[PDB]
Amino acid sequence: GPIKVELPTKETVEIGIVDYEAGASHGNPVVDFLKRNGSTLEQKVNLENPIPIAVLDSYTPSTNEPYARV
Amino acid sequence: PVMADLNGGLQFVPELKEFTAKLRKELVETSEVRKAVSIETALEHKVV
Numbered sequence A: 001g002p003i004k005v006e007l008p009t010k011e012t013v014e015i016g017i018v019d020y021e022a023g024a025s026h027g028n029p030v031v032d033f034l035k036r037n038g039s040t041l042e043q044k045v046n047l048e049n050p051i052p053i054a055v056l057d058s059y060t061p062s063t064n065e066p067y068a069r070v
Numbered sequence B: 001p002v003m004a005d006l007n008g009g010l011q012f013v014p015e016l017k018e019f020t021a022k023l024r025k026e027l028v029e030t031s032e033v034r035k036a037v038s039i040e041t042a043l044e045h046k047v048v
Helices: A027-038 A063-067 B016-047
Strands: A001-007 A012-017
Touching: A027 B016
Parallel strands: none
Antiparallel strands: A001 A012
16 A cells, blocks of 8 residues: 655655565564554544434334335 | 873864764664664564
């Protein structure tokens, strides 16, 4: 995969590649190193507390034939 | 009154503070880099 460096405008541009190939192995050294030495960037961010929307009721049809046929 | 100089020629070295700091910094740099690189190589061998 690509390696990119953050610019002063907070933009990332590529400056190199990762590549690793091995035969018989017990794990991935690249990701192990990155986990031990880097930080994980998660796109999902949780609200302070969840916001309830609704609790709804639904029913399965008596026959599965119409959905099967559509 | 006698003045004996037993400084072993050290007075002729210019900028002694900077020179000694450079020497020590180069030694610590070598040591730490070697140690950390060896640790990382050991971890990668153990995981692979």
